[PDB]
Design an enzyme around this catalytic site. Structure first.
Site, mmCIF file in Angstrom:
data_model
loop_
_atom_site.group_PDB
_atom_site.id
_atom_site.type_symbol
_atom_site.label_atom_id
_atom_site.label_comp_id
_atom_site.label_asym_id
_atom_site.label_seq_id
_atom_site.Cartn_x
_atom_site.Cartn_y
_atom_site.Cartn_z
ATOM 1 N N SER A 1 -0.373 -33.530 -10.711
ATOM 2 C CA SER A 1 0.101 -32.282 -10.834
ATOM 3 C C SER A 1 1.690 -32.145 -10.925
ATOM 4 C CB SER A 1 -0.575 -31.403 -9.735
ATOM 5 O OG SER A 1 -1.725 -31.279 -9.726
ATOM 6 N N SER B 1 -2.383 -25.250 -11.465
ATOM 7 C CA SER B 1 -2.340 -26.500 -12.115
ATOM 8 C C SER B 1 -3.596 -26.855 -12.924
ATOM 9 C CB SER B 1 -2.035 -27.769 -11.283
ATOM 10 O OG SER B 1 -0.785 -27.780 -10.879
#
Lengths: 248, 248
Positions: free
Chosen positions: A98, A50
Site C-alpha cells: 500500500s 487503499s
C-alpha cells in the site's frame, strides 16, 4: 446491477464479539447470489482508501502512465510516511505494501480529466474525485459501498471492465495474496485512518477466492477509531468464510 | 539467443551430498547473467514431462482449444491414475496438480500439425513430437535442456513468446506457487518416471522468482530411478538459491 442479496443476521455473531460496527458481503459465483449481515450498511458508501489502488493501477496502465507490468517505481531517497515504502518497488510491490506516494504520483500523471473518465466507465462509487487529484481517495469526497466493490471486482475477475484484458490481468496478478494448487486468493486492504470525534474511519478488506471450480467475491468494511482494531478487517471475514466452508 | 553462462563447480556440493546427477541453471535479471554447476549438462536435452504443460497451455489458448482462463475441465467419472485428478479442474488447477489426462486431451484437440508449428515459434527443445500425439512429452522423442527452459521462461516472463500478451499472462497466473508481499514464485515440476538403472528418468523444477525489484530464472533437472528421491528436485535448488540470498 442485477445483484440479489440476502440478509443473514447470524453473521453478526462475529462482529458483536469484538463490538465492531461493520458489514460483510459474500457472493458465490456471481452477484446474483450474495449475502450480508446488514443490508443497510452493504449499500452505504465509504472512502475507499487503499482499495482504490485496484482501479488506479488499471487506469495507470490504460493511460500509459504505468508503461507495463515491469515498471519500477524508484524511491528518490526523501522521507516517506512508512519505512516499508522507502525503497524501489514493482507494481505488485507497491500495491502489496500500500505504497501511497507511488499511487499519488500515478494519480497526478493520470490527471483529473482521465481519472474522471475511467471512474465513470468503471461505475466506481459516487465517482467524485474533487478537491485534490493526489488525495481524493484518502480524504476527499470519493465514496464506494461494499456492494459496489463486489460488482467492480466481479467485473475485474471476468475481464469485463472497460479496459484492455491484458491490463486487467496484470493488476489481478498483482493482487494475488495466497496461492496453493487449488486455492487462490486475490485481495486488498484499506484503512482511511481513525477518523475524528463521532466520525470514525473505515477499514476494508476486499477480494475474491477461487477454490476448485468455484469463485467467491467479498467486501468487508468496518468503523475504526483505534489502530489496534485493524486486524479484525481480515479476522472477521476469515471467520465467516471458514464457517461457510470456503477457508479450510 | 544471447545467454552468458558461467560454470561454478562449488554448487556441486549440494548434489554430491545426496548422490544426485543433475544440473541447476540460475540467471539474475536476464539470460545475460547465468550460472550453473555443469555447463555440459546445462545444454543436455531431456524429456520435459509435466513442464510441457506450460507451452501446451499457451498453445491450448492460442488455438481456441482452451476458450479462456475460466474454462472448466470436466471429469467424466472414469478412473484416472490418481485420485487428485478425479474432479473438475480449472486451467490453473490442472497445471498445479499436473493432470496428465486433461493435457493429453488438449494435445489431441490441438493436433500434431498445430503443435509442430508452435513448438517451432517457441524454439522449444528438439521440437520432436513423434510417436504419441498425446504422449510425446512423457515417453516420446521431445527433449529440452535446462538452458532452453530458462530462455523459454524468460521469454514468457517478458511476454515475448509468439502468442498474444493476454494468453501469456493467463498461463503465468496459473504458474504462481508462492505469493507474499515482495516475494513471488512462478514454478512447475516434472517427473517422466523412474526409467531404468541403465537409462534413469528425469525430474525437473523450473520457474522464476521475483524478489524486491529483482528477477531470477531457474531450471533444475536430475537423474532419478527411485521415487523416494523426487523431493530433491525442490530441496537442492532451494538450498542453492538460499545461499545466493534469494530464498527470502
Amino acid at each position: 446491477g442485477h445483484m440479489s442479496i440476502t440478509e443473514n443476521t447470524s453473521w453478526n455473531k462475529e462482529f458483536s464479539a469484538e463490538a465492531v460496527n461493520g458489514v460483510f458481503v459474500l457472493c458465490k459465483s456471481s452477484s446474483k447470489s450474495c449475502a450480508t449481515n446488514d443490508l443497510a450498511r452493504a449499500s452505504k458508501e465509504y472512502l475507499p482508501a487503499s482499495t482504490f489502488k485496484i482501479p488506479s493501477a488499471i487506469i495507470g496502465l490504460e493511460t500509459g502512465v504505468i508503461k507495463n507490468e515491469h515498471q519500477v517505481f524508484k524511491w528518490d531517497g526523501k522521507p516517506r510516511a512508512m519505512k516499508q515504502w522507502e525503497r524501489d518497488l514493482t507494481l505488485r510491490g507497491a500495491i502489496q505494501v500500500s505504497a501511497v506516494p507511488v499511487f499519488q504520483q500515478i494519480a497526478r500523471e493520470v490527471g483529473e480529466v482521465r481519472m474522471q473518465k475511467y471512474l465513470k466507465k468503471f461505475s466506481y462509487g459516487n465517482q467524485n474525485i474533487s478537491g485534490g487529484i493526489d488525495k481524493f481517495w484518502l480524504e476527499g469526497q470519493l465514496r464506494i459501498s461494499a456492494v459496489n466493490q463486489v460488482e467492480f471486482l466481479e467485473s475485474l475477475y471476468l475481464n469485463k471492465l472497460s479496459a484492455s484484458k491484458e491490463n486487467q490481468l496484470i493488476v489481478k496478478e498483482a493482487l494475488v495474496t495466497e496461492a496453493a494448487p487449488e486455492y487462490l486468493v486475490h485481495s486488498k486492504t484499506g484503512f482511511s485512518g481513525v477518523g475524528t470525534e463521532s466520525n470514525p474511519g473505515v477499514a476494508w478488506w476486499v477480494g475474491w477466492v477461487e477454490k476448485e471450480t468455484e469463485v467467491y467475491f467479498f467486501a468487508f468494511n468496518m468503523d475504526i477509531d483505534n489502530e489496534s482494531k485493524l486486524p479484525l478487517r481480515k479476522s472477521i471475514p476469515t471467520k465467516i468464510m471458514e464457517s461457510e466452508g470456503i477457508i479450510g
